Amino acid sequence: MGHHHHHHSHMKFLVENLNGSSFELEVDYRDTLLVVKQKIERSQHIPVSKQTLIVDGIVILREDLTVEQCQIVPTSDIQLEVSS
């Protein structure tokens, strides 16, 4: 009777692009780092290849890993530094 644990996979992490605009991108745990940056591309208007994901100091250069593996949460400092 009752009790249903509903998990929220939708994560809106603040894509804080210093050379652009901060945007909370709503990604799912299932989405890969390759796909998530394609979302960012249309948002920051910068090509995926120039999206230097800097989280807490670490650069995220992986397309093969999903966000559920990297566990990139909005409670970390997620910034973008536009490579010219």
Q: Quick check: helix, strand or coil at residue 38?
A: helix
Report CA dihedral (35, 71, 75, 20) to the nearest 10 degrees.
Answer: -20
Whose tokens are 């566990």? That residue is 71
d(CA 55, CA 76): 7
d(CA 51, CA 30): 20
Write down all domains in the chain, each with its CATH number in brackets: 10-82 (3.10.20.90)
What's the token pair of residue 24?
């909370």
Give the start-end residues of each E strand in 3-72. 11-17, 22-27, 51-55, 58-59
Strand partners, 52: 81
The answer to whether 15 and 52 are in contact (CB under 8 A) is no
